[PDB]
Symmetry: D2
Amino acid sequence: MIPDDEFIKNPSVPGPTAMEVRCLIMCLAEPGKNDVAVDVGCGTGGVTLELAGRVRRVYAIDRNPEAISTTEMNLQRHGLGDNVTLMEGDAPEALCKIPDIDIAVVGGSGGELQEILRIIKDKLKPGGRIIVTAILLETKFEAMECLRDLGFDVNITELNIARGRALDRGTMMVSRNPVALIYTGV
Amino acid sequence: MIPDDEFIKNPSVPGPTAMEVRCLIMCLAEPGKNDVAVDVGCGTGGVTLELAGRVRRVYAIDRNPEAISTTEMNLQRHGLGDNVTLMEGDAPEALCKIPDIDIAVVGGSGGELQEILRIIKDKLKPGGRIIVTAILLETKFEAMECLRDLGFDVNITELNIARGRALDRGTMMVSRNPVALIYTGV
Amino acid sequence: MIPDDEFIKNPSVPGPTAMEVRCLIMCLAEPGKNDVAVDVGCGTGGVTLELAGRVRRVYAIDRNPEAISTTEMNLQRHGLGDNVTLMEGDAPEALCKIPDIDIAVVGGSGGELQEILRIIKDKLKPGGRIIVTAILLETKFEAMECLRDLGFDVNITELNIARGRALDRGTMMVSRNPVALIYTGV
Amino acid sequence: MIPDDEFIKNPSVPGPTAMEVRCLIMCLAEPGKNDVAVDVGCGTGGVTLELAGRVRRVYAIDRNPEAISTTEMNLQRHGLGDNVTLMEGDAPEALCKIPDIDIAVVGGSGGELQEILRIIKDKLKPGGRIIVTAILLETKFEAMECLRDLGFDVNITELNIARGRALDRGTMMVSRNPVALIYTGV
């Protein structure tokens, strides 16, 4: 997996998602080379990158132009992007212009989460997977609720990662903020 | 990834390792189809399974006969095992009968961790990766120390996972015990 | 603090709350010998005990008879209870029969959390503190939301505790499930 | 408890210790108004503060002059310090100039942890308590080992705290680095 260090950040663009989380999302999404995926709120490009290398097509969406810019840069740094359709603008509008999906990774809460999820449920091919990355306590709840309301079997996994930082004095554990992955049964 | 639920457990055999951890081990190990791997202390077979599907050869070792038995069963349930050499008995003895390795996943502390690590360092192909799964606070330290003494750049990641369990009353977060992954730089 | 071990458990009654959590609730609640406190959903009696020894009066409420029973037993084992009014039945009904409070520790989600909180806000003496112990992901959200809606400054602290268990092989870290303490500014 | 916010920090002086940890240390230490306590490596003064208000005497030690300086300031901001003997210099040297102790809170690993612990064991009144705050993975192990070697019953509790930070977008959980408290049975 591309570690967080090899990502070109941008002060106004959140990310990249911790490799440990990207790790897990990849396993939950269980990409197939014929799967069409959508990464809503692609940020620095973390998930898009990982998906780019394992699925047929990836539609990366984000309101923030700098994010599409950063994701673009990062795809190029890692020579991916041939199969990645970057998309500027409002997630719900963008999502309508997309084909049906097998995998949906929704990071960007962007308020309109419930709307995005409804849209996604409608474009989800049978056996599709939705994975919502929640940073805000509200998103954890809202995602759980929507997914259940859209008739999905919802699961949730909260990841608390700590990496050691070598100091002269020794190895200190440094925490990433908790990240929850709300995902629908396959 | 095969979820913990699809594993055939055995009351006397610990495991399977949380999918979230197996997930991360897979990313840290970064299996190559030409990589030879060894899973010391294969338990229920979790890591062996994951590795089986991504590397050339996997040598699964474990003192406990029931573990070799359970891993054997689980390999079959998931149609893997063709490239998995199961091995009974003392890990250091078994390890000497193995070819050089690219990836080493050492779970089974089995006391003799330091000895296993020494053996492994000697059979580690250049650019090889060692990942020690530590359940015991002592193994976290002992592994860090050996790895550093054997001249490796040691890193550590503690994973605290919680999965929601749906109750009538609502979703409750249930913790897995902390698991640390001590790993050598690639 | 009375450690979890010295509590008389009851298979049908959840608790006691990890000493680490009780410890923190005690500090957030900042009991004063003249403070009147209410422990909604007193379970095994953990918080009731701690409060009993530091405040003027403690009203312990719980739907479950076994819990009032168990809390009663534990109060006696530790010679407290002189200043503890145990209360059987529905929390909202019981809460109305109570005097105004300085401290409110709400553990028992019991569905009716929002109602309990509204009742509590109305009986909260100026400078009072509310602390809701959340086990369920929904309660974390719901409590945050209510407290904010009732005009409180809401804070949240998620505790992930792990205690070592000495085995022959060594000390192993054992996790308690995550517990969140949603509390109102003083 | 004095929250982390009301502490006068100093860029070169680590601390204050998270209120959640200070909270727990106070409970494990179980101060008595007649207890003599020593805070080795007093940092910003967190523990010293808490102890100051509950025990007879507190000897605060720290190599770093800025730390004794900052602790000094903080004691004054909170009108404590009348019963606090600040001490400059090498912890082992300072420790010999102290009377016997009931409570010892050792934060400052300062390398010489094992030496400090031996000294403390010798000055520990019967039924005394030692609590070592470990930030470094090495200290967790070393403390456990010494305490056991000095014939103490050693216990350990790893605390992973996350506090919500209110953003416009919502509440986000922010982690403190893991902190372990190794403590001797009373």
